[PDB]
Every structure is written in structure tokens, then in C-alpha cells.
Write a protein that binds this ligand. Structure first.
Ligand SMILES: CCOP(=O)(COc1ccc(C[C@H](NC(=O)O[C@H]2CO[C@H]3OCC[C@H]32)[C@H](O)CN(CC(CC)CC)S(=O)(=O)c2ccc([C@H](C)O)cc2)cc1)OCC
Lengths: 99, 99
């Protein structure tokens, strides 16, 4: 679709078989989700944002469906204030900015 | 233009008479710029993201030109690690997400 920006670009995603709401975030290199139970092995990772760095769990090659588009890639889990879909997955679903 | 997301969506802006590089950021409600001494009155604010909060100065009705498209709105100034163009200005230049 075409998504305007008068409101937050919130979408439904499906991950680990459950539905969640997430923000499409072009300013994010990486996809970061709030604390959740995900199957599979993970490694500790650190990621930095506007306020400094946080500890996350890095899950590789995870299946995620974003508004009905399939992606497979890295998902970070940790104390983000909001679930964010970053560029690593936006590129897989063919997202561009246009103006 | 059309901006793909393989790399950070960095563009040149003009603000307070100066040229800067900034990120087109659909995950940001508001625009946040690197420390700059802008004329005019401001109000203090705290803004939060990954890692916590930072203290900024809120300036109203600031003109910014983004790739030659003019926008007017609120800008937050402070020690952000990157210049962020948020939705308050992206909507003015007609920016959409498309996939
Ligand atoms: C030189 C680089 O330095 P660092 O690595 C960090 O640099 C940065 C720092 C921030 C960004 C942009 C931000 N992306 C981000 O956090 O992305 C994460 C994931 O992927 C990583 O890629 C880039 C960073 C990592 C978000 O797009 C926008 N944010 C919203 C929230 C949603 C609420 C995100 C959770 S917000 O900026 O917090 C914010 C908060 C309030 C407001 C006003 C109030 O509306 C405006 C903006 C990009 C690069 O320094 C580490 C110390």
C-alpha cells in the first residue's frame, strides 16, 4: 500500500505465530521488539538509540509477516519503548520513501 | 524522489540558514536536530527512545527545506547523535511509505 504519515505508521505483524503491533521505522537500521518469548537460539547483542545503549537478544533468520508480506531476518528483543520494524526488514518487503 | 532503504535515508536540509545532513524518519513523531544556537524563544523538553531520555530545546515555527521542499514546524534541538526529520515535517513535504 501507500502509507501517509499523519498518524504513526503502525502495522500488524505475525511473529513466532502471534500477532503484534509494530511501527515502520525508516530511522532504524534494525528491527527491535519488546520483551517476548521467541523460539530458537539467540546471542547477546547491544544496540544504541537516542538515549544510549541497551542489551538485547539477537535472533537470526526469524520468519516475520508484516502486513501480509513475508520477511526472514534478524530480530532483536529487549527494552525498546515501542516495537519497531527497521530497514533490515523494510527492504525485504520492498518499502521505499516517496515524495 | 524515491528513496530506497538499503542505506540510511540521509538527505541535505537547510535550517537557520545552514546546510546539514538528516535522516528521513517515519518512526519519529517530531524532528530533532543537533545542537545549534537558533534565535528565538524555546521551551525545555525531555524526549525518549532506546536507551532513555535526552534534554532538548523546543522551537516553534521553524523553517526547514528538505531536498528543496519547504516545511514549517516544531524542531527539538539538543545532543542527539543524528539529525532526525520526523513526521511533523515529512507530512508537509508529501512523504509516503510505499510497498
Ligand atoms: C551515530 C549513531 O549513534 P548511536 O548508535 C544511535 O544513533 C541513532 C539514534 C536514533 C535514531 C532514530 C531512531 N532509531 C533507533 O533508535 O534505531 C535503533 C534500531 O536500529 C538502530 O539503528 C539506528 C539506531 C538503532 C528512531 O527512528 C526514532 N526514535 C523513536 C523510537 C520510537 C519511539 C525508536 C525506538 S528516537 O530517535 O528515539 C525519537 C524519540 C522521540 C522523538 C520526538 C519526541 O518525537 C523523535 C525521535 C537513529 C540513529 O548511539 C548510541 C548511543
Amino acid at each position: 500500500p501507500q502509507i501517509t504519515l499523519w498518524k504513526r505508521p503502525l502495522v500488524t505483524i505475525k511473529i513466532g505465530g502471534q500477532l503484534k503491533e509494530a511501527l515502520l521505522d525508516t530511522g532504524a537500521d534494525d528491527t527491535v521488539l519488546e520483551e517476548m518469548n521467541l523460539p530458537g537460539r539467540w546471542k547477546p547483542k547491544m544496540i544504541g538509540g537516542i538515549g544510549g545503549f541497551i542489551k538485547v537478544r539477537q535472533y537470526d533468520q526469524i520468519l516475520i509477516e508484516i502486513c501480509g508480506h513475508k520477511a526472514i531476518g534478524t530480530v532483536l528483543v529487549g527494552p525498546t519503548p515501542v516495537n519497531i520494524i527497521g530497514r533490515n526488514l523494510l527492504t525485504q518487503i520492498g518499502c521505499t520513501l516517496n515524495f
